[PDB]
Amino acid sequence: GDVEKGKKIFIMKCSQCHTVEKGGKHKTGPNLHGLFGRKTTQAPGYSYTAANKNKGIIWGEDTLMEYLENPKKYIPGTKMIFVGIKKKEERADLIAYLKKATNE
Numbered sequence: 688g689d690v691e692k693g694k695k696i697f698i699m700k701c702s703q704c705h706t707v708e709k710g711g712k713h714k715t716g717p718n719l720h721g722l723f724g725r726k727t728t729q730a731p732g733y734s735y736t737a738a739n740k741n742k743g744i745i746w747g748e749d750t751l752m753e754y755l756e757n758p759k760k761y762i763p764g765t766k767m768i769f770v771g772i773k774k775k776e777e778r779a780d781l782i783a784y785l786k787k788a789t790n791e
């Protein structure tokens with residue numbers, strides 16, 4: 688998990704909809720601080736879909752590896768309009784970046 692490659696992926700593919708800093712503002716998508724070890728639909732103040740609430744999983748490496756390959760397939764009906772990342776390494780590198788940036 689290369690975080691520098693993952694940071695560069697996050698800017699290209701997520702940064703327009705997401706922030707990672709603690710106390711970062713909600714944008715189109717929720718602020719991602721505290722993502723790891725947290726159930727879905729748990730960012731305070733963000734309006735999720737009923738689909739995201741119906742999932743009810745714990746966000747970690749394995750659930751993020753499968754979600755980011757195809758979000759519509761993992762959480763059907765989600766309003767996150769992202770096609771997905773096909774390459775293992777980009778998802779693994781991006782998750783390595785998320786593990787450091789979202790944990791303050």
Ligand code: HEC
Pocket residue numbers: 696697700701702703704705715716717722726727728729730734735736738739755764765766767768769781
């Ligand atoms: C807008 C154009 C987005 C882009 C690009 C990315 N995301 Fe996203 N994300 C967006 C929305 C609107 C939502 C809410 C989904 C819903 O149904 O309510 C999300 C959600 C997530 C989540 C789940 C957060 C949670 O369950 O608490 C994660 C983990 C997430 N987004 C990550 C993520 C990554 C890693 C992205 C790029 C690689 C990315 N998102 C792109 C909006 C948008």
